[PDB]
Each structure stands twice: as structure tokens, then as C-alpha cells.
Amino acid sequence: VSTRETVNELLRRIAAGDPGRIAELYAEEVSWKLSWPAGDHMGVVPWIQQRSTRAGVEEHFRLIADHSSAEVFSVLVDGADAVVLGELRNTAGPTGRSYEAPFALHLTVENGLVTRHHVYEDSLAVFRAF
């Protein structure tokens, strides 16, 4: 079924929290990218690290939940590709500092499965929270 249907189902599963069910939406192999410097992968902001498979995606959603709300402004869809436009308004577990990060979430869907997850977000604001 559709690219847009797949994405809306992803947003609702993400809003609902269960990481295993979130990962169920993801392809076995996943292209995972983040607008964070190479050298700061697995740095002070802990989820920032490279990922490659569904199980990796699962561990990611378990980890943002360990270390808060989110608004979705729009969802642009153009074929197999989509961009979720919103804002993260969370608070960093360790430092206690509350932060807001605008994000654009780029997704690709093939056969109802997410094959790409590329986050573009205010990396410096998140970083200063940690």
C-alpha cells in the first residue's frame, strides 16, 4: 500500500513508543543517516551513531526513550520518498536542559517497508543540551 499510508503508520507507531513494533515497519537493511558530524557519532549525544539493519533501528528507538513531545507540521510525499517536517521539543536526561530541534525526516518506502531514514535536524541545539 501507499507511501503516505506507510509513513502515517510510522508516525503513529513512533508516537506510541513500542520500539519493537516501530522496527517492524523497517526493511531488513536500512540506509540510516543523520545531519551530525562523523566525529561525534557515539559522542555526548548517545543515539548519534551509524545504524544498518532493522534491529539497529530498534535499538535506536529504545535509546532515545531512555535518554518530552513532538509536533509534525507536514508530510511531503513524492513517489517512494517522503519528508516529515516537524519539531522535537524534549529535555536531555543527564543535563536536565530542555531543547527544541527542528527536523526534516527523509524516508524511502519499498513494498510497504522503510528502506531509508535520513534525519536533518538542529544538531547544535541537541548537542548543547548534552
* Chain residues in the site for a second copy (CB under 8 A): 33, 35-37, 40, 74, 76-78, 81-83, 85, 101-104, 106, 118, 120-128
Q: How many CA atoms lie within 13 A of 44 on its CB side?
A: 11
**Residue 119 contacts ligand H5J per CB under 6 A:** yes
Q: From CA 24, how far away is CA 54, in angstroms rounded?
A: 8
Identify what 88 binds: a second copy, ligand H5J, none; CB under 5 to 8 Å per kind: ligand H5J
- The interface partner of residue 7, options being a second copy, ligand H5J, none and the CB cut-off 5 to 8 Å by kind, is none
Q: Nearest CA to 67 among 129, 115, 3?
A: 129
Which grid coordinates are listed for 116?
Answer: 531509508
Say whether residue 88 binds ligand H5J (CB under 6 A).
Answer: yes
